[PDB]
From a paper:
Human glycolipid transfer protein (hsGLTP) forms the prototypical GLTP fold and is characterized by a broad transfer selectivity for glycosphingolipids (GSLs). In human GLTP, a glycolipid headgroup recognition centre located on the protein surface enables selective binding of the GSL head and ceramide amide groups via multiple specific interactions. Encapsulation of lipid chains within the hydrophobic pocket involves a cleft-like gating mechanism that results in two glycolipid-binding modes. To elucidate the structural dynamics of the GLTP–GSL dimer and associated adaptations, we comparatively analyzed nine novel crystal structures of wild-type GLTP (wtGLTP) and the sulfatide-specific mutants D48V and A47D/D48V complexed with N-lauroyl-containing monosulfatide (N-lauroyl-3-O-sulfo-galactosylceramide; hereafter referred to as 12:0 monoSF) and disulfatide (N-lauroyl-3,6-di-O-sulfo-galactosylceramide; hereafter referred to as 12:0 diSF) in different crystal forms and compared them with previously studied GLTP–24:1 monoSF complexes.
Because the double mutation A47D/D48V restores the open dimer conformation along with the local negative charge repulsion in the dimer, we also studied the crystal structure of the double mutant A47D/D48V complexed with 12:0 monoSF. The mutations D48V and A47D/D48V, which reversibly regulate access of sphingosine to the hydrophobic pocket, mediate the regulation in the disulfatide (12:0 diSF) differently compared with the monosulfatide (12:0 monoSF) or in the short-acyl-chain sulfatide (12:0 monoSF) compared with the long-acyl-chain sulfatide (24:1 monoSF). Similarly, SF complexes with mutant D48V systematically deviate from those with wtGLTP or the double mutant A47D/D48V.
Numbering used by the authors:
A (entry chain A), B (entry chain A): 8 to 209
Write the structure that this text describes.
Amino acid sequence: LLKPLPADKQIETGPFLEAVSHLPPFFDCLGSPVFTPIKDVISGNITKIKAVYDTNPAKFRTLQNILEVEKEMYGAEWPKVGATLALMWLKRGLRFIQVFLQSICDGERDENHPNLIRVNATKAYEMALKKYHGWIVQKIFQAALYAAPYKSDFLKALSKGQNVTEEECLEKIRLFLVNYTATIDVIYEMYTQMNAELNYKV
Amino acid sequence: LLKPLPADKQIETGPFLEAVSHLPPFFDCLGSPVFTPIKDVISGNITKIKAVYDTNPAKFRTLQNILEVEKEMYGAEWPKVGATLALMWLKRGLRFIQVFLQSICDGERDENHPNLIRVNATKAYEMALKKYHGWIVQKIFQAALYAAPYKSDFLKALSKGQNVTEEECLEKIRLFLVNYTATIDVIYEMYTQMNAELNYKV
């Protein structure tokens, strides 16, 4: 689980990186090599943030510190630079995972295709990522979607094989989502208040 | 350029890894982020081979040595294991690049779509990779193809911006292809003679 936010809503960079570093692996709950490239993309963002943090953990103590430091370090190349860029993209992958899991927990489904997770992934994609992809990457997403597992399998993949009902799994996901969602929200507000959000497409 | 093969047709592992390590970058002659994941896939194979070589460069002096050593090291998990696996997949990416470049040099083109390289890429894909992909990855290839550059641009990307005619570029590619193709051929023969080739799909 992620720490709760402190009253000052500052997010400590070290603890944050340690928590998010447990996310990429999970993509192998999706159960197909198609998603391995995605894990490495997310993992790349986390690496890049850590490599900058590691250079001066004090200067880069909080996520806010990264943005404001890099803003003065880089001038006109900022925010399309350094850890600020990497975190700009990491927050979008995190949000995808948040929206996807929340949509599953909220019982959203396609009533005639109940064992799939395609509607949940698509919603997650539309809310987190689609705005930032050109059509080639969108078509790539559409194709990749088909590699997505059955809901039943996914959930069983989430519970480390450990024998809990689907209902119990979802209750634990809901618990995870509280501090996760609040953390992602704070990162998005920081990007807004720093005018560090860019809208270019890949 | 790659060294020529020696009379014994053994391929020294160190020099081979150094030569192929100059290939991934080029994928950024394709001129779009869609191909960055592919670079990292190929680069991953080269890393994995090097990490095994590095452990005992003498024991792993040649590519042949890697296969025969791993065969006795691993038993029934071989050849779907270690550097033998990584090289099994690396040779396929290398072959793709060989067939693609050769097809371009041979003047193969779609006469009504002359400025594209799609026929060349597809041929390269059918000859090197398609057999080893399931349909999701094939559809992903089809979508990605659209990110491929114009022939004119690609060629200009290959000549480090340096101002040589297209004809001169192709002549240099043809020269590159001689030892490259002969090297890849030798690797494929080794996999055959070692019964190390596997046909599973991703």
